[PDB]
Amino acid sequence: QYIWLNETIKSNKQLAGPRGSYKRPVSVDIFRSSTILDPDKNYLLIVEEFHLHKIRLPLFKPAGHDYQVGIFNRSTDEIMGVREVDFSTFVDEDGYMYDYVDVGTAINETLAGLCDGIIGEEDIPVFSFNKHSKKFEITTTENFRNGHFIMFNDDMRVDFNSFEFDDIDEEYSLVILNEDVETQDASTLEFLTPISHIVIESNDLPVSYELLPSIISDNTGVFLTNYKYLQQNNQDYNSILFRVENSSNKYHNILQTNFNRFNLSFTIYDYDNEKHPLTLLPQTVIQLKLLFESI
Amino acid sequence: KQYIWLNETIKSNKQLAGPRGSYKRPVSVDIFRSSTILDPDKNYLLIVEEFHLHKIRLPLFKPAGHDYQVGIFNRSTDEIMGVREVDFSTFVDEDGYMYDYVDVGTAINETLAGLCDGIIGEEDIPVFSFNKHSKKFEITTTENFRNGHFIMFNDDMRVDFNSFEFDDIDEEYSLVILNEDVETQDASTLEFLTPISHIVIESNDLPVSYELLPSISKNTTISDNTGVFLTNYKYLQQNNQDYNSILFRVNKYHNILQTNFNRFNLSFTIYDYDNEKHPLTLLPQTVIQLKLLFESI
Amino acid sequence: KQYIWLNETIKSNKQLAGPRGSYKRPVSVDIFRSSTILDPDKNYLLIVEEFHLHKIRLPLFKPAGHDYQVGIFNRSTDEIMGVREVDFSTFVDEDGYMYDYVDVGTAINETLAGLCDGIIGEEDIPVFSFNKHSKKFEITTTENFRNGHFIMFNDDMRVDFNSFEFDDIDEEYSLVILNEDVETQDASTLEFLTPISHIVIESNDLPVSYELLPSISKNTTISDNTGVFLTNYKYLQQNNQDYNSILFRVENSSNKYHNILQTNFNRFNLSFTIYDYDNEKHPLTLLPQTVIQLKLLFESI
Amino acid sequence: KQYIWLNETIKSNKQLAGPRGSYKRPVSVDIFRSSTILDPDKNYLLIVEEFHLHKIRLPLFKPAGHDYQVGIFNRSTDEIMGVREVDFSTFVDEDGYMYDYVDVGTAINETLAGLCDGIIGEEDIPVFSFNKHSKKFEITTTENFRNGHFIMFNDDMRVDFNSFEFDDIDEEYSLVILNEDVETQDASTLEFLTPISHIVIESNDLPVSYELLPSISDNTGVFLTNYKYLQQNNQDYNSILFRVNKYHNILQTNFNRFNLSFTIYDYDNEKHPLTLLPQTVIQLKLLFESI
Amino acid sequence: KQYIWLNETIKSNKQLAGPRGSYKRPVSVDIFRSSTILDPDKNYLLIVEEFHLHKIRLPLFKPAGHDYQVGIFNRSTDEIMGVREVDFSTFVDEDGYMYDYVDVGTAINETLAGLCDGIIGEEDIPVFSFNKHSKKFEITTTENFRNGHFIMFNDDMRVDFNSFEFDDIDEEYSLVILNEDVETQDASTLEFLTPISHIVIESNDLPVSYELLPSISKNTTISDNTGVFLTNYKYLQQNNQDYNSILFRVENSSNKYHNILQTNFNRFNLSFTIYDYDNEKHPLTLLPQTVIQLKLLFESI
């Protein structure tokens, strides 16, 4: 026996707020007059599909990183200076950033402020994001490359690993520049994104919880599905579509048969395990299809 | 274990469909057999193995669901010169749909040209357009416009054409950051413009178990609402193609409640993102194919 | 559970198939075993695990299906100068097929040129054609033609060459919007032209359950009809390739099983058959160079 | 329900395989265990979960299969000037194979050049060649050649190099239409030219249910797996990876020894083994699944 | 029937793993639950659903495995002028690995340049190098070098850099055919250079059935060897990326189940291990920025 349950959420300006400023969590109450399941049977739950049409996800989270840029002199053979990359001007209230151009601007302003006293404005290097290639780029003069190197610390080195590097120190590495415009060997947006996965969870649905580590552990958490997210490009706004294939093992046992209501909520888990709820926009449309399959 | 396969097909012509499909005839099939289809002692599941909607027409855009507004900002005086609501009424068909993204771009452009009429000199009027080859919208401007003015997109414009670079200025409006004569999107956004969500096969008289639905009443939460659906095909708009040939090939089972039938109807239906349903209709050139599998447990 | 695999092959040559496969010999395989294939005590499901139609020729267009018409509009006088039906009769072989999209483009171009022969000067006659590289049709015009006139497509032409930009004048006719000297399609429309729907393996003497089909009559809905179908491969015309090498392999956990009814047999025939969109069936014919592989599975319950 | 996995591997060296695999040592593994593999009471199915043929060499062409012929037509006189057969014998190895599509393009070009040697001058001799970048064969000509002459392909050339535009003059020969200096193919046709049909793992001593084969017939042949090979590019040396309901019945559950070979079937069905190289590292993972 | 889901995650920092992961701490996690995990009466299978090795370093080349040799040939005198062995020792790390194909290109180049020292002019010395953009090795030469000489690759080089156009002269050595200033490979060969074969999850103290391995010894061809393996991720080197973010999800190849032998347990240890093509094993090691995620399915029968 296959029991199918469709659900939808609309939105508008009045429910969500301008630019979704009310941060209303994505949630649906399911509520039926009749009972949903047959008392004499045992049911596995699986989420067959969902569609998160028109939502806004963050692209970068400064708190998790400790970036540091520096300048190295080739004649004198020493470190001239090192500065910490200051994101506080570009961050929203919740500690997020929504554009990889701005990650590049932050890194650039730190780099420009460091070379203010030391190097002439003609040769101050420029760090920027290229919208077309999805790659960060370093733009420099020939005078700069003969005189100096740009230095990255390890956090920078790892997240922007597609540049060519030379290790000088336990921490710091030199960026090897051979041309006016130097770009990344490969995109590294996967390394920058804080989003790990999006999850459907219910406080009141009688379903066997998944086993977790501690905040030794006896900890548990309700998870109906587990969507792994990957930042493909610089798109702040997204339309995320999920559909299972022929033999997905992603079932969950239902412990009690007799219920006529429950709540479903969409939540985002970051790479540092800070969970936060997915919120509506005026234009958001959410769709959802649960299967209850008898054993 | 038993595999009963039921093929079915619809040919079309000008008589059935009308010129350009103007009769709006629903896609539908009666399957009528002399013998009974299923064996009385078994229980069966139903899955749609494949279908083909060869030569059909689908809408590319539905203006009713959007509130697009463009505006001009003056950098010298640092204030809003005007804001106008984009008017799609001269581009829309009788059922509220549009069928070309070049036309979506023209609609936006004419609003922009009307808004700039007295306020900016003709040579410096910016041009909004859809690029057929890249499937991206573009803004074309003079350097003299860029030094003087910004184009303003409201929140709905902001979201649906999100791959331009923006700068917020208040609760509602956002400035389009232009640095070159031709400025284009970083990424196609046709998925944000299409109104078509899914195509569904349904039936009024096939003895098959319903799916549970949220209530018809949009305010109330309680629901005893159901509906027959045999399959659920998610549609994604890949490009600027009005006319399509949709092909589907195959967990998606449905229980058959009673065994004693030889008649049923099948109808293809389109659901939009605003949940309004409407029938898939024929063209003269439409050919439709369909394959059901009744599978015994 | 039991798995009984049955590999099979077909070779060919000039004598068997004829020059360029001109004898039209159907692809057919007598399987014949000395021993009985299946064990009497068990029930068996049949699935075609893979095949390979190496080096065959399929048609790309079938003029019978289509009612193409082109016209010329005059923008000065704002009326139709003329309209003509597109005639393929010279390009078509015996069977009613065409085998190259360059020819499809030529036939439309001829019709268009013959329509402009009296009226418009030879220097700015428009040129319809098929671009081999992009797999897209193209309209080549002069600026003088564009200012003066429009090319008209009818409803059938409109649908099958849908990627051009169009303005609809009438219930029937549409004007092709041209802004530049060489105008092309937004997207490939070869899927709208290929007459091949699917390719089928059917046996005239294998004890296997038949698929239910709709009635032969256009007038009656009540159906008794049935057909033998072992597999049903959906074909899609990717490019302008006349000759093809078609390979099918069953994905993990498909449902394309048929019940076998009788458990006692040691011979059966397998033909390969092509269905078109108009439901006209015709057999897959050999070439001299045609190798054909095939692999059935008989799976017990 | 029981899953019993059997990892296996092969290594190699100069002394085992020879310079450029010149010994032709077949790929083979003797599995031999102290304990009995399977339970005596149960029934088992055999599926090959994954194999990796790392650093191997496979032929790209086999002239034996093909009967190519080229010709020159004259447009002024309107008649066939000559027809020569394409001789591959200079580029072929001992086993009848060829290992690069540029050499396939050269062989046809030498035949084409030899046919125009007496008739047309060197300035207008057409040039047949393989483009390494596009994976497509090209015909280079002059304007003087195109106005005067055509190039004739026979039916076997016509089917394997089908992407060119053609005009049929008779039952065997077809003119290649040419409008520019460098004319090329509509699409890649390496799938036509490759003689490798599939790659098979076959035993000679394992108790497993055989697959029914043709010859009236009563033949049978043991095959543990079947990998369908397709030629993606002009890469002579390869690294073939396979990961997976391709099951087989194990007839007897009392054994602890068998010999797994690797074999290459061609489109003419002529079978031959997969030979090692010094650098080769072959991997394999069988599954025994219970009922 | 029952589906028990076990989630596990690992974080890191400077103190834990060391600057650039200098301490080489292996990736390992202890699962310790106060309750028993499984129900006594049922029989459970184990499959790994998904893991995510976020921000980790992996080697791209392992010189020990190869014996590369380069040579110079003289076209005038028609003989070998010399053959040097490619020395990687100045580029390798402590553990025998190289983390950049640019550096593999330089190694070959230094060897090639040193071999031309006495014999060829500074301008006409050929240059071998890796192209970051195309992922292909290139040979930059003068017209004067090509008219006078050829570069010679031994068999090991010939295989791993097979996409150049070669010509055999003897059993070991092969000329590289060069017709332009810059000559590139026809296709990528990074698959031929990577030493990482697969990444593996294993456990010393989980009661689960072991897989059957071949013999440790060269002498006795008979085997008795077994190993504990929870999953087997086949790795493929896409590009020149030193640092990686490896995601696995069981979508297809879902046969990778393992029989749990004992139901009575509440604790085990999961460790990540890398196997190379010479079958040497070494652990996966953390970095300060590494985050590892894991999900296990215990499924009953």
DSSP character string of C260-283 = B--S--SEEEEEEEEEETT--EEE
**At B184, which helix (H) or strand (E)?**
strand B182-184
Give the gap in angstroms from C-alpha A189 to the nearest C-alpha of chain B.
15
Residue D269, Ramachandran bin (φ over 0: left; ψ between -120 and 50: alpha; else beta): left
CA dihedral B205, B206, B209, B214 (to 10 degrees): -40
Count H helices and E strands in chain D, helices first: 5, 19
- Taking an 8 Å cut-off on Cβ atoms, the answer to whether E171 and D277 are in contact is no
State yes or no: chains A and E have 3 or more CB pairs below 8 A: yes
A129: closest CA among A144, A107, A109? A107
Q: Could you identify the residue written with the tokens 């060459």?
A: C161
Dihedral over Cα of C257, C258, C263, C267: its sign: negative
D99: closest CA among D270, D220, D231? D231
Structure tokens at C115: 């329509």
Distance CA E185, CA E71 (A): 19
Distance CA D65, CA D256 (A): 42
Amino acid at D231: Q
Give the nearest partner residue to B223 out of A13, A32, A101, using CB atoms: A32
Strand order in the sheet with C79-85: C79-85, C69-74, C149-153, C174-176, C166-168
E126: closest CA among E79, E48, E73, E85? E73
Assess contact for A148 and A119: CB atoms under 8 A: yes
Structure tokens at B282: 């024929």
Angle at A21 between CA A19 and CA A22, to 5 degrees: 135
Assess contact for D159 and C212: CB atoms under 8 A: no
Is C34 an interface residue toward D (CB < 8 Å)? yes
Residue C197, Ramachandran bin (φ over 0: left; ψ between -120 and 50: alpha; else beta): alpha
Angle at C204 between CA C199 and CA C209, to 5 degrees: 85
**At B103, which helix (H) or strand (E)?**
helix B101-115
Distance CA E91, CA E108 (A): 11
Q: Could you identify the residue written with the tokens 């399911």?
A: A30
Chain D residues whose beta carbon lies within 8 Å of the beta carbon of residue C9: 214, 269
Distance CA A183, CA A163 (A): 7
Amino acid at D224: L
Give the gap in angstroms from C-alpha E38 to the nearest C-alpha of chain A.
12
Give the helix ranges, DSSP H, for chain E: 14-17, 101-115, 143-148, 155-160
Distance CA E263, CA E53 (A): 29
Backbone angles phi, psi at E269, to 5 degrees: -125, 125
Angle at A274 between CA A272 and CA A279, to 5 degrees: 130
Distance CA D210, CA D287 (A): 17
Q: What 3-state class would DSSP assign to A76?
A: coil
State yes or no: chains D and B have 3 or more CB pairs below 8 A: no
Burial class for C122, CB neighbours closer than 10 Å (0-12, 13-18, 19+): exposed
Structure tokens at D3: 């899953």
Assess contact for D286 and D50: CB atoms under 8 A: no
Distance CA B294, CA C5 (A): 26
Strand order in the sheet with E182-184: E127-131, E136-140, E182-184
Structure tokens at E119: 């014999």
- Taking an 8 Å cut-off on Cβ atoms, the answer to whether E45 and D277 are in contact is no
Backbone angles phi, psi at E19, to 5 degrees: -50, 120
Distance CA A235, CA A229 (A): 13
DSSP single-letter state for residue B224: -
- Window A:180-239, CB contacts with E under 8 Å: 185-186, 190-191, 196, 208, 210-213, 216-218, 221, 223, 226, 228, 230
Q: Are B186 and B205 in a shared domain?
A: no
Give the nearest partner residue to C155 out of B11, B19, B34, using CB atoms: B19
Is D132 an interface residue toward E (CB < 8 Å)? yes
Q: What is the resolution of this structure in A?
A: 2.9
Structure tokens at B14: 């000008």
Structure tokens at E248: 């696995």
B251: closest CA among A50, A244, A294, C258? A244
Strand order in the sheet with A135-139: A126-130, A135-139, A181-183
Residue E150, C-beta contacts closer than 8 angstroms, at least 6 positions apart: E72, E73, E75, E175, E176, E177, E178
Residue D128: beta bridge partners? D139
Amino acid at D13: N
Q: Are B226 and B166 in a shared domain?
A: no
- The Cβ of residue B127 has, within 10 Å, a number of other Cβ atoms equal to 13
- Taking an 8 Å cut-off on Cβ atoms, the answer to whether D237 and E279 are in contact is no
Assess contact for E298 and E37: CB atoms under 8 A: yes
Which of A246, A247, A248, A249 is most worth mutating to test chain C (most C CB atoms within 10 A of its CB)?
Answer: A246
Strand residues in C203-242 grouped as ranges (E): 211-212, 226-227, 231-234
Q: What 3-state class would DSSP assign to A289?
A: strand
Nearest CA in chain D to E230: D5
Residue E225, Ramachandran bin (φ over 0: left; ψ between -120 and 50: alpha; else beta): beta
Distance CA A246, CA E258 (A): 21
Contact pairs from chain B to chain C, CB under 8 Å: 98
Amino acid at E70: V
Alpha-carbon radius of gyration of chain B: 25
Q: Could you identify the residue written with the tokens 């596990």?
A: E8
Distance CA D52, CA A202 (A): 44
Residue E272: beta bridge partners? E201
Which of C45, C190, C209, C255 is most worth mutating to test chain B (most B CB atoms within 10 A of its CB)?
Answer: C255
Q: Which residue segment(s) compose the domain that A37 sits in?
A: 1-59+193-295
Burial class for A168, CB neighbours closer than 10 Å (0-12, 13-18, 19+): middle
Distance CA E105, CA E92 (A): 13
Report the relative pairing of strands D257-266 and D28-32 from DSSP bridges. antiparallel
A211: closest CA among E297, D18, D240, C96? E297
Q: Are C160 and C237 in a shared domain?
A: no
Angle at E204 between CA E203 and CA E205, to 5 degrees: 95
Is C252 an interface residue toward A (CB < 8 Å)? yes
Q: Are E34 and E106 in a shared domain?
A: no
User: Considering D165, D193, D221, which residue would you say is the last residue of a domain?
Assistant: D193
Is B113 an interface residue toward C (CB < 8 Å)? no
Count H helices and E strands in chain B, helices first: 5, 20
Give the gap in angstroms from C-alpha E133 to the nearest C-alpha of chain A.
6
Burial class for B51, CB neighbours closer than 10 Å (0-12, 13-18, 19+): buried
D56: closest CA among D264, D269, D271, D266? D264
Is A118 an interface residue toward E (CB < 8 Å)? no
- The gap between the terminal CA atoms of chain A, to the nearest Å, is 8
- Taking an 8 Å cut-off on Cβ atoms, the answer to whether D33 and E165 are in contact is no
- Taking an 8 Å cut-off on Cβ atoms, the answer to whether C214 and B55 are in contact is no
User: Considering B162, B193, B224, which residue would you say is the last residue of a domain?
Assistant: B193
Amino acid at D208: V
**At C204, which helix (H) or strand (E)?**
none
- The Cβ of residue D135 has, within 10 Å, a number of other Cβ atoms equal to 19
B265: closest CA among C218, C221, C277? C221
Determine the length of chain E: 301
Give the gap in angstroms from C-alpha C297 to the nearest C-alpha of chain A.
21
Q: Are C65 and C7 in a shared domain?
A: no
Residue E121, C-beta contacts closer than 8 angstroms, at least 6 positions apart: none
Distance CA D147, CA A8 (A): 69
Amino acid at B115: L
User: Considering B137, B169, B193, which residue would you say is the last residue of a domain?
Assistant: B193
Q: Are B56 and B202 in a shared domain?
A: yes
Structure tokens at C295: 């692999």
DSSP single-letter state for residue E187: S
Q: Are E130 and E90 in a shared domain?
A: yes
Distance CA C133, CA C199 (A): 27
Dihedral over Cα of D84, D90, D96, D101: its sign: negative
Q: What 3-state class would DSSP assign to C43?
A: coil
- Taking an 8 Å cut-off on Cβ atoms, the answer to whether E33 and A191 are in contact is no
Distance CA A114, CA C187 (A): 51
Structure tokens at E195: 């030493």
Amino acid at E84: R
Backbone angles phi, psi at A192, to 5 degrees: -90, -35
Buried b (16+ CB within 10 A) or exposed e, A265-274: bbbbbbbeee
Q: What 3-state class would DSSP assign to B99?
A: coil
Give the gap in angstroms from C-alpha A290 to the nearest C-alpha of chain C.
22
Residue A150: beta bridge partners? A71, A175
Residue B95: beta bridge partners? none
**At C143, which helix (H) or strand (E)?**
helix C143-148
Q: What 3-state class would DSSP assign to D289?
A: strand
- The gap between the terminal CA atoms of chain B, to the nearest Å, is 6
Q: What 3-state class would DSSP assign to D107?
A: helix
- Taking an 8 Å cut-off on Cβ atoms, the answer to whether E32 and A223 are in contact is no
Give the gap in angstroms from C-alpha B262 to the nearest C-alpha of chain C.
10
Q: Could you identify the residue written with the tokens 């002009």?
A: D234
Distances (CA, A) of A292 to A43, A202, A209, A253, B49: 6, 15, 16, 10, 21
- Taking an 8 Å cut-off on Cβ atoms, the answer to whether C162 and B245 are in contact is no
Structure tokens at C191: 């899927």
- Taking an 8 Å cut-off on Cβ atoms, the answer to whether B162 and A236 are in contact is yes
Angle at A282 between CA A278 and CA A287, to 5 degrees: 60
Using CB atoms, list chains with 3+ pairs below 8 Å to chain D: C, E
Q: Are A32 and A6 in a shared domain?
A: yes
Distance CA C290, CA C272 (A): 13
Assess contact for A103 and A192: CB atoms under 8 A: yes
Q: Percentage helix, strand, coil, to 5, in chain E?
A: 15, 40, 45
Dihedral over Cα of B132, B134, B135, B137: its sign: negative
Method: X-ray
Distance CA A178, CA E86 (A): 26
Q: Are B261 and B145 in a shared domain?
A: no
Q: What 3-state class would DSSP assign to B158?
A: helix
Determine the length of chain D: 291
Distance CA B254, CA B228 (A): 10
State yes or no: chains B and E have 3 or more CB pairs below 8 A: no
- Taking an 8 Å cut-off on Cβ atoms, the answer to whether D55 and E224 are in contact is no
Using CB atoms, list chains with 3+ pairs below 8 Å to chain C: A, B, D
Q: Are E188 and E217 in a shared domain?
A: no
Is A240 an interface residue toward B (CB < 8 Å)? no
- Taking an 8 Å cut-off on Cβ atoms, the answer to whether C234 and B55 are in contact is no
Task: Please report how many Cα atoms fall inside a 13 Å half-sphere around the Cα of residue B235, on the Cβ side.
Answer: 24
Using CB atoms, list chains with 3+ pairs below 8 Å to chain E: A, D
Q: Could you identify the residue written with the tokens 């026979």?
A: D154
Assess contact for C75 and C147: CB atoms under 8 A: yes
Cα D279 off chain centre by = 21
Burial class for B233, CB neighbours closer than 10 Å (0-12, 13-18, 19+): middle
Q: Are D212 and D144 in a shared domain?
A: no
Distance CA A149, CA A123 (A): 12
> Domain total for chain A?
2
Q: Are E2 and E68 in a shared domain?
A: no
Assess contact for A163 and A156: CB atoms under 8 A: no
Strand residues in chain A grouped as ranges (E): 2-9, 27-31, 43-56, 68-73, 79-84, 126-130, 135-139, 148-152, 165-167, 173-175, 181-183, 195-201, 210-211, 220-221, 225-228, 237-243, 252-253, 261-270, 275-277, 285-294
Assess contact for B190 and B137: CB atoms under 8 A: no
Report the relative pairing of strands D44-57 and D281-290 from DSSP bridges. antiparallel
